[PDB]
Amino acid sequence: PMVLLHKSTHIFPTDFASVSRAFFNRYPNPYSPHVLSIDTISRNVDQEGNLRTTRLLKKSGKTETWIIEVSVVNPANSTMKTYTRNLDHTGIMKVEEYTTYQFSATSSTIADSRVKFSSGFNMGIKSKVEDWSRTKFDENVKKSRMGMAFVIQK
């Protein structure tokens, strides 16, 4: 269904270790009052030496929504990739966020984020408008044909 993608870049003036640990310890903070809980579903060191983690968040808004967060930390390359998406209300809207953190020229951690918003109601509106147009078409065709018969009658 309807898909939209936006991209942004932010540079943290800190080491990759500090930024990564902070990502894993983000809540609670005064700038994110909507997060209600975080839970670590899985965490291991993969065959390539990269830390794979899957965490589970819950959030409020204007009413509560579950969110999955997948993350890979390559310590050899000092890189990190994060992805997040809601698990419920997926038929209404799906918000996916993909961010890459990399580390020395500026001695900073660059985070390139890209969010994909995909709403599925674009077809749910079309289906109801389709039934509506079918009904209106039947009614109008019947009325027009009956008027034509009436005027043949004269």
Binding site: F16, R21, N25, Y27
Partner: protein, 63 residues
């Protein structure tokens, strides 16, 4: 940081602190005991919340 099940929150903190040490110092699986405690609590809570409503609804009979 809370947990979706409050009874697990303290075990979650006990895993999170150990994993923070492990990550900050060693990695940049020694916390397996607190990990077992936390994952057991979380598995029990997931079982409860996600499964039991169906069973308690299906338990509706002359006992």
């Amino acid at each position: 940081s809370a947990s979706f099940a409050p009874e697990c929150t303290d075990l979650k903190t006990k895993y999170d602190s150990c994993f923070n040490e492990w990550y900050s110092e060693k990695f940049l699986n020694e916390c397996s005991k607190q990990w077992y405690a936390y994952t057991t609590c979380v598995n029990a809570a997931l079982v409860k919340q996600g499964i039991k409503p169906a069973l308690d609804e299906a338990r509706e009979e002359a006992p």
